[PDB]
Amino acid sequence: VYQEPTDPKFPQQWYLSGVTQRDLNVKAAWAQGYTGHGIVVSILDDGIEKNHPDLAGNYDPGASFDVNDQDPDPQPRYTQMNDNRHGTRCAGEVAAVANNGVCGVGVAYNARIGGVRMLDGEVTDAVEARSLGLNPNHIHIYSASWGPEDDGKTVDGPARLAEEAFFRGVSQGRGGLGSIFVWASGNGGREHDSCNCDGYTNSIYTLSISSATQFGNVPWYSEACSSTLATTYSSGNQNEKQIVTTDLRQKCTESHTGTSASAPLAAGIIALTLEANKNLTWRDMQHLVVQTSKPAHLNANDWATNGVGRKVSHSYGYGLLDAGAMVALAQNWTTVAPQRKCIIDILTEPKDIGKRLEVRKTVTACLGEPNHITRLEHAQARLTLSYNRRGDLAIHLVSPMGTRSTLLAARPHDYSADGFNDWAFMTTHSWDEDPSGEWVLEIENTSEANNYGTLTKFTLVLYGTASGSLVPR
């Protein structure tokens, strides 16, 4: 009965549906009746062309604002270089209109789509906070294809107002269920960047999304880290197809690329999922992504099976999003229990790093207390350390179930002598594991240089629950 879209470029949207199974399985969700109706997505970027032929029918002024100029109208600033095309391309991936003879279709082609014009100017902490906290009882899902510089040297995250916006959003947004923040994991692959040095992607309040090429490979721009949750298709080499979306000046493009394209596709899939169950909390959504994402046919050299039998990669998280499986699992989903937080101060004295440091600690994860965790969600190793050349460090964290998370890989361009100041390295790779037992932190000098430094604080922060486990995969 379901008739797929007839838009002229829909046949070029290989990542939405194909016979090849190299797709996001979105048509299967459409055929179950989920196309985004009633869900509101906002693109936090350089503006949205609200009169675009393939966006106008879905555009939502209530999902939109211009923070750069402080007015309601997020229209991009037109320039000769077309610099401000980026948000319009992201918007079409989410919610381009279907069956209208124009371009292709959004993942959630009946969702309402808005944009916050906030990148076209100085992006201050207050700018980010006003964008992340925009209309949080109207907007369901925020999509951000931007972040700190991908030079492979920067360690940067949200400052106070932005961090407050994340916490207010997941606590009080969406009627108390929590705003959904979707983040692009980054374009710093060529610089050997790590998305754990990015506090937006590294945050537990964002779903950080990585990219795969059409042929199932790790793209040149991809950043590996333990905080990534899942993956959607994006661009690769010039023999691989790219992303089809709305472009500036009312055009259609078939050459949208990079990490920027992956987050909007995830945001669309999450919109379909919210339509299938509007009562999902922000943590529910991350559970669904973990349980339904698909490693198969994604190539990586670091696939590992965690303690509950799920395959996980630092390039891909739990793998490709599967929209059909998301909306199917969402329908009868039982809300997860309230989030518990167990804070474990590991060190009794500072430790010289030297060539290599290993810190072992057996934990009870708040046994006997209301924050006892037997089912891990996110885990953080909040580290304070000094070191003479930060990019020579590699840091690994091993869970009691034996899951080795790379918190930090070598960054050849990171010459900083600033160390880390209570930086909350995050891993998703031990999701649903029991965190009781021996944790191991490994810090090593990956260069031949005589480096030196001291680890002065290691707080292991565990989030999760104590009920509801599934039989391991």
């Binding site: 350089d46 980026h86 931007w146 972040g147 700190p148 510089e149 991908d150 940067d156």
Partner: peptide, 4 residues
Amino acid sequence: XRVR
């Protein structure tokens, strides 16, 4: 900072 912040980059697209």
